[PDB]
Design a protein around this nucleic acid. Sequence first.
DNA 1: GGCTGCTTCAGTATTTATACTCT
DNA 2: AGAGTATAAAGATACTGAAGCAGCC
Lengths: 148, 1335, 62, 49, 50
Amino acid sequence: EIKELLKLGDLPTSGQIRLYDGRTGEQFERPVTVGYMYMLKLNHLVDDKMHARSTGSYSLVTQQPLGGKAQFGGQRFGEMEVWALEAYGAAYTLQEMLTVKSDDVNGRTKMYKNIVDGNHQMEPGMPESFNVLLKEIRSLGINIELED
Amino acid sequence: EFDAIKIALASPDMIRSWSFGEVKKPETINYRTFKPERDGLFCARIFGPVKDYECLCGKYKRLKHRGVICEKCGVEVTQTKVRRERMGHIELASPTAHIWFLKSLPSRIGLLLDMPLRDIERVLYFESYVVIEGGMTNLERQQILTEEQYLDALEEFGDEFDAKMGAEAIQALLKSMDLEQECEQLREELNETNSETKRKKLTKRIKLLEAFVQSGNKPEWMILTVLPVLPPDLRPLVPLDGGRFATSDLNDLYRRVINRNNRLKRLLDLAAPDIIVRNEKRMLQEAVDALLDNGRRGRAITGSNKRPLKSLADMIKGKQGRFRQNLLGKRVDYSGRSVITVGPYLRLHQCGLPKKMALELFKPFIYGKLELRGLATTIKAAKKMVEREEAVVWDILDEVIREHPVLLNRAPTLHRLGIQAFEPVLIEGKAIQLHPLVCAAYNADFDGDQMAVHVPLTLEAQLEARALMMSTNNILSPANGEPIIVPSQDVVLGLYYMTRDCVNAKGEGMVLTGPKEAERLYRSGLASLHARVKVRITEYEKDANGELVAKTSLKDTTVGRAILWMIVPKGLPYSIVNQALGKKAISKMLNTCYRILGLKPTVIFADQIMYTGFAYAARSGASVGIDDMVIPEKKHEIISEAEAEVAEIQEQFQSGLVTAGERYNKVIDIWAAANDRVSKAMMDNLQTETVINRDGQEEKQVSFNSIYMMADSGARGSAAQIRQLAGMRGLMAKPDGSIIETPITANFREGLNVLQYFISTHGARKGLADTALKTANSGYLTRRLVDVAQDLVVTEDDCGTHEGIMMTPVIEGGDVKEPLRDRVLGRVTAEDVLKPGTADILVPRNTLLHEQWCDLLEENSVDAVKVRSVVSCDTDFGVCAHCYGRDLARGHIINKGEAIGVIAAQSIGEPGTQLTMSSIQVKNKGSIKLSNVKSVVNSSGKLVITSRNTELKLIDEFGRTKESYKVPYGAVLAKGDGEQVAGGETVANWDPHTMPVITEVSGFVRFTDMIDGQTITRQTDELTGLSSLVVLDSAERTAGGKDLRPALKIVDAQGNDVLIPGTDMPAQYFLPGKAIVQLEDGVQISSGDTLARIPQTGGLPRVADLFEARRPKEPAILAEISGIVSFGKETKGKRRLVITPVDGSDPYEEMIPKWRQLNVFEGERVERGDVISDGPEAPHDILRLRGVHAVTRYIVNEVQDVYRLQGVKINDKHIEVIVRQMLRKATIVNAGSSDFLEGEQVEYSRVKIANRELEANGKVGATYSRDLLGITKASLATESFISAASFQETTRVLTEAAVAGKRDELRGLKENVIVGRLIPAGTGYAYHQDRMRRR
Amino acid sequence: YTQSWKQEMIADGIEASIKGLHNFDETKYKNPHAYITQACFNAFVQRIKKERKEVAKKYSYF
Amino acid sequence: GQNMRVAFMPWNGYNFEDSILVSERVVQEDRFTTIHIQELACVSRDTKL
Amino acid sequence: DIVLNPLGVPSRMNIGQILETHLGMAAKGIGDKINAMLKQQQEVAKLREF
DNA sequence: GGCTGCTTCAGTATTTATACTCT
DNA sequence: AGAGTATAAAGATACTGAAGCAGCC
Ligand SMILES: [Mg+2]
Ligand SMILES: [Zn+2]
Ligand SMILES: [Zn+2]
């Protein structure tokens, strides 16, 4: 009955017709299938997704950049990404991706200054969430410290 | 800066010294002025000023008043940064216990006071007393007293003797426990100890006591008397990170503690009934416990929503403690996220990057360039300029981008190729362009996947992203050196439609003077694209010393192949094209290009392939119509005959001629038959619908049905899909796992009616749920994997050894499963290999085997090679390069420093989500070999083999084994050794439904020791009739003849025991129960008739349990040492078996369950590692008995087996290194001249170097046995605690480390990240070499 | 409402009643059931007031 | 949604994996445009002072 | 208007989306058979019959 | 008395209704 | 901030492991 209806029109019962290119005008061999399909639009609109961040709002407990798009939040650089970036001999990018670009407070300010001043260089320091962990264990009866 | 982290326990004086003043009051904030209380939880006087350089009164505000303290409040004027790190301390009235040290399982208290934990718990919660200083009465130093008993013993003995209950009691107890004397007494008692159980208990206790006495600790420090409090800005009253407000619940807990503490003190000014003081002390203990580690006590307390509030410790456990949430994986600045799209105009080393995002990310660079050129003066000038997006910022932007790589990443970063570098080009949109070849490493479809963009900053990061992670350096999957830039699915269809051949096409038969002529003829439309033609071509070649000589000829091709040949670079053979170019073909083309030419030409040529494939795929116009699904006009005939046949079977069963299970299986089989028939008919019809004339009558060729072109080219799909499209679609499963009788006799071109759609739906949803939970499990598995290895760094070049494994091609018995070429492809051999011309070496001893030597050994019919390995490497703290092999991502030896452990972990884990959840009829022709043979020629001319270690190895004519087969005890070989054999005929067959137990001598037999009533039973055979008196099992016999088992002492017609040939011990065997002797007694026996008859997962979980070394359910018992067998006391709980040597003393007299069917009889002689029972295997025994290489080859074999049924292809090096990390602990048995103890484990490297140092002098080292630990156990039982604390159950590992007072130099990776330093993997390896060499 | 407050209320009421039993008239009012009930009741309600106002402090700071 | 005229064929790879290629008789006729309504509110509270 | 990809069909066995596409065109075919019949004028009896 | 099979437990994947009177 | 106060009986995971514990030959 589909073919009967196609014949009531005039199109080929095969349902495929010959097309041409628009850039060259030379026929496409192997007749192709054109028709009418009911297309939708799903509300994952790209402008709701696209999001970047230069420098924004840190937290107080641990001075890591906030998370999400509602806030001016950075990206989640999870475990697996550290494993993978560690499989390469990539030893400096992994450093700066968890001391300067995230948490070392003095370090990241000096980084901003040295970037404005045309000097791509970093002073690592020591993270902050680590010191949080220390004061949090040492708050139990566990004397945890560092040697020389 | 700082050296190792050190940890210990905290004496109360230390807590006091840390603090800045005693917190005293339970209130926090003034509620109107929002100032701290006078001495509350937040008072500025203890910690510091709430704001910068001020007090609450308002008399100091600026640097004019820096350093001095206030007058009224007296708070010191300083920064506010110090309010983040100053602690406080509560002073408790009634001392309190540390719930870690009491419910840690084990209890570092419960095993130091030796009492079961219930007692110390009932004492601490005030329900019984404890007799401190039992003194001159009938009471013991650790005796508990019920209140009744206490009252009474006070009536009789209300003397000076001490008796208390509560934390102070245990405190005094621990205070009154000398340690050195206790340790000496336990040393003595252990020396005297006899049982193993109490021996183990005593050694655990003595280990803990030594741990204490050595380190600067003391037992009473487990009991809390002064409690340190957490600085306020680490738990601010309300955190206030926008939006919702949080609680920072610690505050609450703290308050309650102080509250109750305060209350207690006031009762000490009221002299209350001591029942109430006791109840208050109980409440205080409970509160301190719930604060330190909630939930550990019986019930956790909830603030609201019934959600248990987060105690202090729960800020370190779980997926959300500092470890798994903020020390390993933190959020980062300078980053973005978007959706992705294609842009097939890109090269391989660039990606799209929307203008908006790029403007946001590189902002500080832009400000720098502006303030350099002078286009602004202040920073805000630059900000406003950028904000108005003036026409000058764009040139600055596309200037700074010039060579500033970005790092792209996808969400689940499975393997190393989920994060790669690029150089971006600006784009007018909001989406990321991505080169269509790289969407395989990312496994990124375009259904709306998203990606993240990061930006390196410093010089080093840019150099690393450019030289290491660039997209044009990673074309070889580090798992297996196969190329990962395979053009996926449209390029393939283009290149496959191009290089083909129609039978008789326009412009055929001509002759062309080069490719360009073919191109012109195509564009001009004068000649078709796939038409047979003869064209001149030229080919360069590099047969010279790296020089390309040219040579031309007149080949016979089609137009398409000619055109394509313009793409191929210089030095390739033209034969690489003449074929029809499916998908695997072009992958091999790329591989050959890589091996022959190098790297840059390879990527260039792949890019060009992409261009051309896309172009001619478009030019094709390859739609997919509805008439591309053709139905065999006989499908209804196949189905009609199948359904007419099934009705006969149905009425046959119903009319009572067969059972129901048989009928069911018969219907299933006829349906499978019809299905395969119709699938074959359809596929053959569709593949050659071509019937076409060629200036003659007609001809046929491979068809042009677009669906077929998509199938055979490897473009998209398998023949199963086409089967479901045109033919019937299988039989679907059932929820249980069974199969329904009637199958689905329709397809996706007819219409499935309702029921069939229903059933298919069932199957589909089952699949989907499986996929979800499969990702779930595989994630955990790969986590454990990466954790256990986590630290192996190639730190040598040659460990200096001559060991290894005999790599040999695997054969499952029929077809080969892997040629030797692969197993040793790129792996340094141990010793030189000899031609099968023995004493004629073929390659030196220490050479890296790349493809040249691979083919060389391939043609010479080499069989097996002792190749080096990592399991037997000879390095302390690492592995040598040579033991590893080739990098598998670059065609050369692995460099010195690469972190092979992590890449191994990722490679083994990534494919995880792809997993799931007789006789010898030899077919080939070659020589036969036997193995482990003992046999006898039968009375029917044939030779029956009568051992269980027996195995056939069918060699070819050359000397390489091609088949292998197992023959059990007593199988009649048709042919002897050395004789050739053809295909089809059997070589041996036995009776599996019984146990042939023919004797291997000549003599006689009797019905001796076979007496009814007590030993045997009269039994008339119920099928033939001959007297077949079976012996009932001893458990079914009478009690007297239960141990009195029957025997048949084999003799001759004289009665003398017929000696087994050469043996002084004839076959005097205890025939077990269920041993039917159908033949009569006193009859002569010849070989060829038995003496008695005894009638008769694979998913990812398998990989998991094999890696954890789970022990099977019914293991197979092995042979510790040689000798003979004997049976004794029947079932002292379980049956008994004793084994004796031939010369040594018999040490093995063990229990065996009755059901165990023995596999070695009494007179038999076995050897170390021989098998005694049947069933699954236990790897620990494999290790301890057969050695180390046995277990490593075992594991390798089974895991490759699981990863082989699913087409996945993993090199072996990785499972080898995982194993090497599994077995790392050695248990000593003999000190030798060393100092270590008897039962304690040691790091194998440590005991090894200790031996090396003792044996430097004439002294004798220690003797040990290695042991196998599952990954989940060797991880936790490691050298460092931060490493293990980062892993599961931080509580236990942490408290044990604290008890011992450990120390961690962080010689590793997962711990040098927490600290945030240069890991010793890449450049960090060199840096650490230098830094360690500083000292 | 909650076991985190209720225990504090009970401990407070017990301390209050113990402190206050100092003043019980023995020659009249021969029932102390109601006496102790009233004491613990008053301490209960005081505790509930203090807690609720501390929570309000959290809000008012927010 | 809107029912369009569509042709099934590869096109220079701009519909490589599952991407879609769209003409400009669809961005011009504005038959896939939508309207969005963000609501914002401000209130006059009463604190101290 | 839109250029889909045929490779998406044979594996993800959703034949419907193609089969629909045929019917779709057929339907539009009867539209352009009226639009022409109606744009240039035409008595109502013919449209009735068609 | 030592050896052994159950047995129990530990480990892993926003928002809370009510003094009285002094003093 | 403190202190005197007098009816009342008011809940469906699943799997793995290790120490503990009664019992036996
Ligand atoms: Mg998708
Ligand atoms: Zn003041
Ligand atoms: Zn080595």
